[PDB]
């Protein structure tokens, strides 16, 4: 009973609070290495004493064996043991010593009241991801085998110099580096692969591009590359390398892999989480006279406040780098006036509403803190003193929340991540801290002793390392943003490869899982808790006839297609120009005749009140205005040329003709109104973050570079430190005071900078400029302001993660309301596509297998008996698995003997499968073909026999066509692997869901293709002379239709859109030459920053909208199937 009395006063939320404080202080202490001498010991001694209290505490609570029953108590026991060991003769400097200690940070779960239940939900969510994980592994293995077959040994191709006049290789293979980087150039010997400069031949080398880690030469390397593609981490770089070493047509491959693997799977995972989280939740005297007037705070007074806030915001949003002294003084005067006005409010209110009651409110204390900080800066007014708190006023914009229902929704989602859903945030913080400390402890010293290998050519250290806690946390955060493989390559070259693999993969997977469970949890909990009349009749007859509609559709298709031949090289084709010219004239005449027919049949009112006959009228007008200009002598006048660039809108006349595009456009139009309001809410938040960024980084991104021949180098600080020294040292006419293209020089360009940091493309350069910043007219210095990274870490958490949770919630609510209004009708689907969907519904549910009769003849019956059993199917399935393992061991440059043995094994396998097909056809006569999987096997067997015979015919025996054709012929063995889908019920259900969702995906992809075609035509007209820099290169440019479509497909996933915006943002020397010897567009290789920022930003927004609509379609299909 004594132990019971001790436990009464030894265990309670006080005891737990003390344990929490002790473990937290232990964590924060173990963050710092070289923790003070003589206390490195004293603290672990204190924390050792923590442990005796915890053991004696059990003794007063549980029993030696009952205590252990709980899984969490063993961790505590491990903690008590290690401690005692280290007191005497335990290795002092082994990596393991504190990695065992860092679990002690994970001990918070057992002491924080409600984390354990949340963790169990996480294991449940993991347990529901089984079938999707199996499908993902199968798909990645299949695509890795395909990639191995097609692209093995290609990324080892490099431009090697020729010889002048022979033992082995004549001197090291002198390569050439592609302009702007130090990486060696990759090429190919194909027609659409890539060409070397003069005096350079394509040769296969021994090394892979990045760090000998980017390859398709083995199943492991191909699997890693396909996992990278599925995660879409720098997938555009691999895309470009593969198309440069193999050919442009192979882009088709990638296309199929960024849709199946990278898109369809991301959506199963989402659904599998969503459904599961839902399952878990659906489971659960004169003072009095002043008071008379002080409480005169009527309706007008609150309006005055809102107007003052708005005017303060619009004055703070007009500061820039080039502010004049009078304008600068105007802003300071306005800020002082507003500050004294807000001080006046609070002093008037508080002395009206007694202080006690005034503080009792929650907006009032917010007002108080804002105004106190404002006055604090008003007192200590230095030029640059706490610029972040100079922007602190901006939070007054949240005052508008009380009347703006969507801002209140953002503020509730923000507050829910620390309230009802605080446990997920706590676990995320613990995971980030634990992996950061583990990475620092295991791979800290290697990063410092081997830095030369992973550092930039002119730098003396890597930009992302693990020597200290801050940089390890930055690496973990960047992994949580989807960028992991480059730092993984960097760490494999500096430390242990196995540790890198395990650490990076575990961090990525287990952090993305918790980030999704918080995103979905926030979404759910927040949001969802006379003769003229006769001829008119005749014309009416003419218009609604089917042949006329077909003719008009064919004319529109031809008009759209003819635009794809007006490219950079049309001036070199003399006859094509005239042919296209006459074709355009006749098409314009035809469409004018159509418009007159619709004006004489439909009637003017009907015509001008249909919104699909206005978009046709407008296009006909544009064309007529152009044609009249061309027949006259005003074709080169600048307004008219701009009107002519509007000929890329001609493909928009196909929307009204085809019904699927029409219905999907109607669905988008029905969603636009709410998208507008959420967009306004986001703009006001990102203005608070853009005004903050302008306060921090205005005019501080200017550098001096040494530009010689297409490569620039930052001038070292030992020679140049100021803009003034930069001019005096420009002796060779080769130093230039340049600026970062995407800077924070004003609020307008700050919006572009935050778009690159939110989409995570181009954010890296913006951050590096910010973290090297110094005062204006001073050369940037390496990480002078390292703690500026945090600023970008707070934008991504609040600006991006929480303003996408708002957008997705609003979209889901709108979609649900629209469905319900359409009586829960399948949107994105045409009427006959609904019949197709009903037929697909009926197929999947018919269980009857109607076994087939037994053949009368004895031998046929015997074959029937030996075929129908389940042992036959199991044996064939394990044979297919053996064949898959046999194809997994193919490696580039292996041996002749291995190739011969593998070929003989393939011959044996195809013979075995042909014998089973013959036996099945001899046992099952017509019934065999009645089934749909037997036809598939039959097709696979025929394709394999055809592959063998055609390879045998087309080998040395006959015409030796390009060897790469053989590589395509042996792609017929993957069907044997695809025959394994027959047994896997989960895979066969997920693929059925995909088949069910295909019909609407077709229409949405039709809109995506139309959008890509229109933008290609604009880009091809506007950006075809820009100098090759960054993304734009001799293969991915805007000089032809295929080159433009490659870039637009690449940036459809927003990948590398900053790399294509970079060359268009050039407006002069040293990057662009104005008055270039021979270019007619702007006389030069410069770009159009304004047209470029509208093109690349509008495209990504529209693409995101289309993708999220596809996401909704696929997720609802998955829910319906399950
Ligand atoms: C930079 C932008 C960073 C954060 C945005 C903060 C928005 C602040 C809104 C204050 C609203 C408020 O003041 O009042 C709202 C109501 C009061 O009304 P009531 O219902 O309580 O009565 O409160 C509520 O309901 C909702 C309570 C919502 C609490 C949201 C803030 C939680 C933490 C914010 C900062 C996190 C660290 C940021 C570090 C930056 C450096
Ligand atoms: C893989 C790529 C494409 C395949 C897409 C297949 C989509 C259509 C399949 C679903 C379907 O619409 O099914 C149609 C029906 C299913 O009726 P059921 O018999 O199940 O009804 C049972 C009742 N009962 C037995 C009494 C009749 O009939 C059928 O199955 C006929 C289905 C025949 C499908 C042949 C597809 C061959 C295409 C490509 C093969 C590529 C191999 C090489 C790959 C190289 C690497 C790229
Ligand atoms: C490009 C876009 C898509 C390409 C692939 C899309 C088509 C995938 C077809 C898979 C398939 O149609 O199978 C599933 C059906 C399911 O039937 P269940 O009885 O399980 O009902 C399921 C029970 N419930 C109602 C609960 C679901 O099976 C059947 O209809 C049996 C009849 C069909 C037999 C030939 C079809 C399979 C041929 C090729 C499939 C290969 C797909 C490769 C995908 C990429 C892998 C890397
Ligand atoms: C809930 C938590 C879940 C956690 C899940 C993720 C766990 C990941 C574990 C991965 C373990 C990897 C073990 C093998 C690594 C050690 C062997 C190794 O040397 O690796 C490096 C290899 C390449 O080596 P190298 O350059 O030729 O130099 C070799 C030389 N002998 C040397 O040591 O210097 O490099 C390779 O062998 C390439 C391996 C690619 C593997 C791709 C895995 C994809 C991840 C799974 C995706 C589906 C999910
Ligand atoms: C929240 C959810 C996402 C919101 C995303 C918002 C993205 C908006 C980007 C706006 C960028 C505006 C911008 O960058 O202006 C700046 C450009 C730069 O021109 P410059 O000649 O090089 O002069 C440089 C000098 N520093 C100067 O501006 O003085 O000055 C220009 O010449 C460009 C002027 C026109 C820019 C219009 C942009 C419209 C984008 C439409 C986006 C919504 C689409 C739907
Ligand atoms: C998924 C599997 C399919 C992915 C895309 C597979 C893409 O392969 C495209 C084929 O057209 C390749 O062309 P060939 O190999 O026929 O051309 C070579 C002949 N010359 C031109 C060199 C002489
Ligand atoms: C769907 C409606 C929108 C698209 C309307 C139909 O567009 C089809 C075009 O893509 C056809 O290809 P091109 O004419 O671009 O290919 C020829 C390219 N060269 C070889 C002449 C340069
Ligand atoms: C750079 C220049 C900008 C590029 C322009 C891009 C424009 C995108 C094209 C969108 C055009 C908008 C077309 C809008 C389609 C709807 C046009 C719809 O009106 C036609 C009707 O037949 C179909 O609509 P409903 O009849 O269902 O609606 C009946 C109206 N009440 C009576 C129910 C209210
Ligand atoms: C109020 C307190 C808030 C504390 C943090 C509340 C929880 O927010 C943490 C998440 O934003 C972390 O996600 P990441 O920013 O690492 O992921 C990148 C964002 N994407 C990938 C989703 C766009
Ligand atoms: C981006 C994603 C692209 C996925 C591209 C998916 O393509 C699959 C389509 O071929 C399936 O289309 P349906 O069989 O539903 O055809 C019915 C439509 N018509 C032809 C009858 C009008
Ligand atoms: C630009 O930077 C350089 C280097 O910091 C400045 O030169 C120094 O100026 C101080 C006086 O402020 C002298 O005491 C040092 O001896 C100077 N060091 C030298 C010669 O490098 C230079 O004056 C600055 N120019 C400006 C103001 O733009
Ligand atoms: C260094 O000198 C070079 C050449 O003397 C300067 O390059 C000039 O740049 C201006 C505009 O910035 C152009 O109008 C000239 O055509 C360029 N001249 C040549 C010959 O290229 C460069 O601006 C100087 N850098 C600094 C900032 O001192
Ligand atoms: C303004 C130019 C550039 C585009 C022209 C768009 C305007 C005139 C077009 C687009 C859609 C058309 C409308 C579609 C809806 C209707 C149908 C009927 O209920 C009355 C007129 C009204 C409201 C039409 C008036 C004109 C209209 C709004
Ligand atoms: C079963 C799971 C873990 C996947 C493993 C399948 C095996 C067959 C795959 C995975 C990686 C593949 C290896 C990748 C690279 C090589 C190097 C070569 O010198 C022998 C073949 C070999 C060793 C391949 C053998 C087959 C391989 C081991
Ligand atoms: C009860 C049912 C209707 C609830 C369904 C909730 C679904 C629709 C929610 C939960 C998680 C959400 C997804 C979370 C992440 C993304 C990625 C983004 O790039 C497109 C939107 C998309 C795909 C969201 C779409 C809506 C979504 C799938
Ligand atoms: C080929 O089929 C498609 C694949 C995708 N795939 C994606 O993987 C993806 C990831 C991130 C984004 C994305 C992120 C941010 C912005 Cl602003 C825009 C886009 O897209 C998207 C499609 O939509 C058109 C179509
Ligand atoms: C390219 O062709 C040259 C001969 O012109 C040959 O020597 C070289 O090896 C070829 N490379 C490849 C990979 O085809
Ligand atoms: C820049 O390039 C030139 C050669 O073109 C070189 O002479 C100069 O020294 C380089 N930069 C520095 C460090 O001054």
Swiss-Prot record:
Source taxon at top rank: Eukaryota
III repeats, residue ranges: 534-843
PTM info: Ubiquitinated by NEDD4L; which promotes its endocytosis. Phosphorylation at Ser-845 by PKC in a highly conserved cytoplasmic loop slows inactivation of the sodium channel and reduces peak sodium currents.
Biological process annotations from GO: AV node cell action potential; bundle of His cell action potential; cardiac muscle cell action potential involved in contraction; membrane depolarization during action potential; odontogenesis of dentin-containing tooth; regulation of atrial cardiac muscle cell membrane depolarization; regulation of cardiac muscle contraction; regulation of heart rate
Localization, UniProt: Cell membrane
II repeat coordinates: 285-529
Chain positions with Phosphoserine modification: 845
Repeat in keyword set: yes
IV repeats: 852-1122
Keyword terms, alphabetized: Cell membrane, Disease variant, Disulfide bond, Glycoprotein, Ion channel, Ion transport, Membrane, Phosphoprotein, Repeat, Sodium, Sodium channel, Sodium transport, Transmembrane, Transmembrane helix, Transport, Ubl conjugation, Voltage-gated channel
Disulfide bond entries: 159-196, 491-500
Glycosylation sites: 189, 212, 453, 706, 722, 730, 1080
GO-annotated cellular components: axon; clathrin complex; extracellular exosome; glutamatergic synapse; plasma membrane; presynaptic membrane; voltage-gated sodium channel complex
Sample GO molecular function, one term: voltage-gated sodium channel activity
Extracellular side: 33-37, 90-95, 156-218, 244-250, 319-329, 382-387, 445-468, 490-498, 566-578, 633-636, 706-747, 770-785, 890-900, 955-966, 1027-1040, 1064-1091
Record field: intramembrane: 219-243, 469-489, 748-769, 1041-1063
Tissue expression profile of the protein: Expressed in the dorsal root ganglia and sciatic nerve.
Membrane topology (Cytoplasmic): 58-70, 116-131, 354-361, 408-423, 605-610, 659-677, 813-865, 925-930, 989-1003
UniProt main location, coarse: membrane
Residue spans of the I repeats: 1-282
Transmembrane segments: 9-32, 38-57, 71-89, 96-115, 132-155, 251-276, 294-318, 330-353, 362-381, 388-407, 424-444, 499-524, 542-565, 579-604, 611-632, 637-658, 678-705, 786-812, 866-889, 901-924, 931-954, 967-988, 1004-1026, 1092-1116
Summary of subunit composition and partner proteins: The channel consists of an ion conducting pore forming alpha-subunit regulated by one or more associated auxiliary subunits SCN1B, SCN2B and SCN3B; electrophysiological properties may vary depending on the type of the associated beta subunits. Found in a number of complexes with PRX, DYNLT1 and PDZD2. Interacts with proteins such as FSTL1, PRX, DYNLT1, PDZD2, S100A10 and many others. Interacts with NEDD4 and NEDD4L.
Entry remark concerning the domains of this protein: The sequence contains 4 internal repeats, each with 5 hydrophobic segments (S1, S2, S3, S5, S6) and one positively charged segment (S4). Segments S4 are probably the voltage-sensors and are characterized by a series of positively charged amino acids at every third position.
Protein function: Tetrodotoxin-resistant channel that mediates the voltage-dependent sodium ion permeability of excitable membranes. Assuming opened or closed conformations in response to the voltage difference across the membrane, the protein forms a sodium-selective channel through which sodium ions may pass in accordance with their electrochemical gradient. Plays a role in neuropathic pain mechanisms.
Stated family: Belongs to the sodium channel (TC 1.A.1.10) family. Nav1.8/SCN10A subfamily.
Designated name of the protein: Sodium channel protein type 10 subunit alpha
Organism for this UniProt entry: Homo sapiens
Gene it is expressed from: SCN10A
């Amino acid at each position: 009973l004594i132990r019971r009395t001790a436990i009464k006063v030894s265990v309670h939320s006080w005891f737990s609070l003390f344990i929490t404080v002790t473990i937290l202080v232990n964590c924060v202490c173990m963050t710092r290495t070289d923790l003070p001498e003589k206390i490195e010991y004293v603290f672990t001694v204190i924390y050792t004493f923590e442990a005796l209290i915890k053991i004696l505490a059990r003794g007063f609570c549980l029993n030696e064996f009952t205590y252990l029953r709980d899984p969490w108590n063993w961790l505590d026991f491990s903690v008590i043991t290690l401690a005692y060991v280290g007191t005497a003769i335990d290795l002092r400097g082994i990596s393991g010593l504190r990695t065992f200690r860092v679990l002690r940070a994970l001990k918070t779960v057992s002491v924080i009241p409600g984390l354990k239940v949340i963790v169990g939900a996480l294991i449940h969510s993991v347990k529901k991801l089984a079938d999707v994980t199996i499908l993902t592994i199968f798909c990645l293995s299949v695509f890795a085998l395909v990639g191995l077959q097609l692209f093995k040994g290609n990324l080892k191709n490099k431009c090697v110099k020729n010889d002048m006049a022979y033992s082995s290789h004549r001197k090291p293979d002198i390569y050439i580096n592609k302009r702007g980087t130090s990486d060696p150039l990759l090429c190919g010997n194909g027609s659409d692969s890539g060409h070397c400069p003069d005096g350079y031949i394509c040769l296969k080398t021994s090394d892979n591009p990045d760090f000998n880690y980017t390859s398709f030469d083995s199943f492991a390397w191909a699997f890693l590359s396909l996992f990278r593609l599925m995660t879409q981490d720098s997938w555009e770089r691999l895309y470009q390398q593969t198309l440069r070493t193999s050919g442009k047509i192979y882009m088709i491959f990638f296309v199929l892999v960024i849709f199946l693997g990278s898109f369809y799977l991301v959506n199963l995972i989402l659904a599998v989480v969503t459904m599961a989280y839902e399952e878990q939740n659906q489971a659960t005297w004169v003072k009095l006279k002043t008071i008379l007037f002080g409480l005169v705070t009527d309706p007008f007074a609150e309006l005055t406040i809102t107007l003052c806030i708005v005017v303060n915001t619009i004055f703070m949003a007009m500061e820039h780098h080039g502010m004049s002294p009078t304008f600068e003084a105007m802003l300071q005067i306005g800020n002082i006036v507003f500050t004294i006005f807000f001080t006046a409010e609070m002093v008037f209110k508080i002395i009206a509403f007694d202080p006690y009651y005034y503080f009792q409110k929650k907006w009032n204390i917010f007002d108080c803190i804002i105004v106190t900080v404002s006055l604090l800066e008003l007192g200590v007014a230095k030029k640059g003193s706490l610029s972040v708190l100079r922007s602190f006023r901006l939070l007054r914009v949240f005052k508008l929340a009380k009347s703006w229902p969507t801002l209140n929704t953002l503020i509730k989602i923000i507050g829910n991540s620390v309230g009802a859903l605080g446990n997920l945030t706590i676990i995320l913080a613990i995971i980030v801290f634990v992996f950061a400390l583990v990475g620092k402890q295991l791979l800290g010293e290697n990063y410092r002793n081997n830095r030369k290998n992973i550092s930039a050519p002119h730098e003396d250290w890597p930009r992302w390392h693990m020597h200290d806690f801050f940089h390890s946390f930055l690496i973990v955060f960047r992994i949580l943003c989807g960028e992991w493989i480059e730092n993984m390559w960097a760490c494999m070259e500096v430390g242990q490869k196995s540790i890198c693999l395990i650490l990076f993969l575990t961090v990525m997977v287990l952090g993305n899982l918790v980030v999704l469970n918080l995103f979905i949890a926030l979404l759910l909990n927040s949001f969802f808790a006379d003769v003229g009349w006769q001829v008119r009749k005749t014309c009416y007859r003419i218009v609604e006839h089917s042949w006329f509609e077909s003719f008009i559709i064919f004319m529109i298709l031809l008009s759209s297609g003819s635009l794809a031949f007006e490219d950079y090289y049309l001036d070199q084709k003399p006859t094509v120009k005239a042919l296209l010219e006459y074709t355009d004239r006749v098409f314009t005449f035809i469409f004018v005749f159509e418009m007159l027919l619709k004006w004489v049949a439909y009637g003017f009112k009907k015509y001008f009140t249909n919104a699909w006959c206005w978009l046709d009228f407008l296009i006909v007008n544009i064309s007529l205005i152009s044609l009249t200009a061309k027949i006259l002598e005003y074709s080169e006048v600048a307004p008219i040329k701009a009107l002519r660039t509007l000929r890329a809108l001609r493909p928009l006349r196909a929307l009204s003709r085809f019904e699927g595009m029409r219905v999907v456009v109607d669905a988008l139009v029905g969603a636009i109104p709410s998208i507008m309001n959420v967009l306004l809410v986001c703009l006001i938040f990102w203005l608070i973050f853009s005004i903050m960024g302008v306060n921090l980084f205005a005019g501080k991104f200017w550098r001096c570079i040494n530009y010689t021949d297409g490569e620039f180098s930052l001038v070292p600080l030992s020679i140049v430190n100021n803009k003034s020294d930069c001019k005096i040292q420009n002796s060779t006419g080769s130093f230039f005071w340049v600026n970062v293209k995407v800077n924070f020089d004003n609020v307008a360009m700050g919006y572009l900078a935050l778009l690159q940091v939110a989409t995570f493309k181009g954010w890296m350069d913006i951050m590096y400029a910010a973290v090297d910043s110094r005062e204006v007219n001073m050369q940037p210095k390496w990480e002078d302001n390292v703690y500026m990274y945090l600023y970008f870490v707070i934008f991504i958490i609040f600006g991006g993660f929480f303003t996408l949770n708002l957008f997705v919630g609003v979209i889901i609510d709108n979609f649900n309301q629209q469905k319900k209004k359409l009586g829960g009708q399948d949107i994105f689907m045409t009427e006959e596509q609904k019949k197709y969907y009903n037929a697909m519904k009926k197929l999947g549910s018919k269980k009857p297998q109607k076994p087939i009769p037994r053949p009368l003849n004895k031998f046929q019956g015997f074959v029937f008996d030996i075929v129908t059993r389940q042992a036959f199917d199991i044996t064939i399935m394990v044979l297919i698995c053996l064949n898959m393992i046999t194809m997994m061991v193919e490696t580039d440059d292996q041996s002749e003997e291995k190739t011969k043995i593998l070929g003989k094994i393939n011959q044996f396998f195809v013979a075995v499968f042909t014998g089973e097909c013959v036996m099945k056809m001899f046992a099952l006569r017509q019934y065999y073909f009645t089934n749909g999987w037997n036809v598939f096997d039959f097709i696979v067997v025929v394709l394999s026999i055809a592959s063998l015979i055609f390879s045998a015919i087309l080998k040395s025996l006959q015409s030796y066509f390009s060897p790469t054709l053989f590589r395509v012929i042996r792609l017929a063995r993957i069907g044997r692997i695809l025959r394994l889908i027959r047994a896997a019920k989960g895979i066969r259900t997920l693929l059925f869901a995909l088949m069910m969702s295909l019909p609407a995906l077709f229409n949405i992809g039709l809109l995506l293709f139309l959008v890509m075609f229109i933008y290609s035509i604009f880009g091809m007209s506007s950006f075809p002379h820009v100098r090759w820099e960054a993304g734009i290169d001799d293969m991915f440019n805007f000089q032809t239709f295929a080159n433009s479509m490659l870039c637009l497909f690449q940036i459809t996933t927003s990948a590398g859109w900053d790399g294509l915006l970079s060359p268009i943002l050039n407006t002069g020397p040293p990057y662009c030459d104005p008055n270039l010897p021979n270019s007619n567009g702007t006389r030069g290789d410069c770009g159009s920053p304004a047209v470029g920022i509208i093109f690349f930003t509008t495209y990504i927004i529209i693409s995101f909208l289309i993708m999220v609509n596809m996401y909704i379609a696929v997720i609802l299909e998955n829910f319906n199937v399950a």
